[PDB]
């Protein structure tokens, strides 16, 4: 029950949970481009010149 002292420890192993692999996909997923505005189909002159 004396509990004598011991020598100096050489190395200290650190145990830790691993990096989060297979979380990010190898291609990227962007928000798609909002489309450029279209001229709508079915546009015709509705105004006739009077008389």
């Amino acid at each position: 029950g004396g509990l004598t002292c011991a020598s100096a420890p050489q190395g200290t192993l650190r145990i830790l949970e691993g990096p989060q692999q297979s979380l990010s996909g190898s291609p990227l997923q962007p928000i798609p481009a909002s489309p450029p505005p279209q001229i709508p189909p079915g546009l015709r002159p509705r105004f006739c010149a009077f008389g």
Binding site: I39, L43, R44, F47
Partner: peptide
């Protein structure tokens, strides 16, 4: 070049 073509379609 968008609203100009809209007006060209409407006659104006």
């Amino acid at each position: 070049e968008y609203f100009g073509e809209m007006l060209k379609a409407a006659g104006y």
